[PDB]
A paper describes a structure:
The cellular retinoic acid-binding proteins CRABPI and CRABPII act as gatekeepers and facilitators for the passage of all-trans-retinoic acid (and related derivatives) through the cytoplasm to access retinoic acid receptors (RARs) in the nucleus. In this article, crystal structures are presented of the L29C mutant of Homo sapiens CRABPI in complex with naturally occurring fatty acids (1.64 Å resolution) and with the synthetic retinoid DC645 (2.41 Å resolution), and of CRABPII in complex with the ligands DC479 (1.80 Å resolution) and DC645 (1.71 Å resolution). The retinoic acid-binding ability of both CRABPI and CRABPII is centred on a hydrophobic pocket created by an orthogonal β-sheet fold and capped with a pair of antiparallel α-helices formed from residues 15–35 partway into the sequence. The pocket contains, at its most buried end, a trio of residues (Arg112, Arg132 and Tyr134 in CRABPI; Arg112, Arg133 and Tyr135 in CRABPII) that are responsible for binding to the carboxylic acid moiety of ATRA, usually in concert with a water molecule that is conserved in all structures with similarly binding ligands.
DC645 was developed as part of a library of synthetic retinoids following the EC23 archetype but lacking the fluorescence-enhancing elements used in earlier series (including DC479). Instead, a tetrahydroquinoxaline derivative offers enhanced hydrogen-bonding opportunities in the mid-section, creating interactions with solvent and Arg60 at the mouth of the binding site, which is likely to help to stabilize the protein–ligand complex. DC645 was chosen for co-crystallization owing to the increasing evidence of its positive effect on neurite outgrowth in cellular models of Alzheimer’s disease. The incorporation of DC645 into the CRABPII binding site, fully engaged with the binding triad, is an important step in understanding its interaction with the retinoid signalling pathway and indicates that the molecule will be transported to the nucleus. The ligand-binding residues and the carboxylic acid motif of the ligand are very closely aligned, with a slight deviation of the tetrahydroquinoxaline tail groups between the CRABPI-L29C and CRABPII structures. The structures presented above may also offer some insight into why CRABPII binds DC645 with greater efficacy than CRABPI-L29C. It can be seen in the ligand-binding site that residue Arg60, which is positioned to create a hydrogen-bonding network between the ligand and several water molecules in CRABPII, does not have the same orientation relative to the ligand in CRABPI-L29C.
Author numbering: 2 to 138
């Protein structure tokens, strides 16, 4: 089961609502929402080892992880966090995050590969769930 590829977005819901729960300044939220409408997502997968680059004109993130092993990244609001990804099923990985400092809403994410050429990202903050769907470019 192979997440590798260059992905572009087709659907998004609750991205703005997610940033709102995390308390992102309303002006920065409006910029992020604009940027997030047109991302380029590059995934390189070798077994359980992943590289994910999410590029927009405003902000680019790169994460490196191995399913089952602790790593560090940022929350979607830009706060350093400790992360752990596990397989929920053959096609779906789930990630729990803990802030390195401070408190804030409980955040997590999932990535799922469908049988019809889609990649589904969810990102959660307390009980706001953002769902983003991508297809290969
Ligand atoms: C205004 C500024 C610089 C700073 C505030 C935050 C919220 C950190 C920010 N976030 C984004 C984004 C995004 C994004 C795109 C795509 C995806 C995806 O996975 O498709 C996720 C997040 C942009 N700009 C900002």
């Amino acid at each position: 089961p192979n997440f590798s590829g260059n992905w572009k977005i087709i659907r998004s819901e609750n991205f703005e609502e997610l940033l709102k729960v995390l308390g992102v300044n309303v002006m920065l939220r409006k910029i992020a929402v604009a940027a997030a409408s047109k991302p380029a997502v590059e995934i390189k997968q070798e077994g359980d080892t992943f590289y994910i680059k999410t590029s927009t004109t405003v902000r680019t993130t790169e994460i490196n992880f191995k399913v089952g092993e602790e790593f560090e990244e940022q929350t979607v609001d830009g706060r350093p966090c400790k992360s752990l990804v596990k397989w929920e099923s053959e096609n779906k990985m789930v990630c729990e995050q803990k802030l390195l400092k401070g408190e804030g809403p409980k955040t997590s994410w999932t990535r799922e590969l469908t049988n019809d050429g889609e990649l589904i990202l969810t990102m959660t903050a307390d009980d706001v769930v953002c769902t983003r769907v991508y297809v290969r470019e």
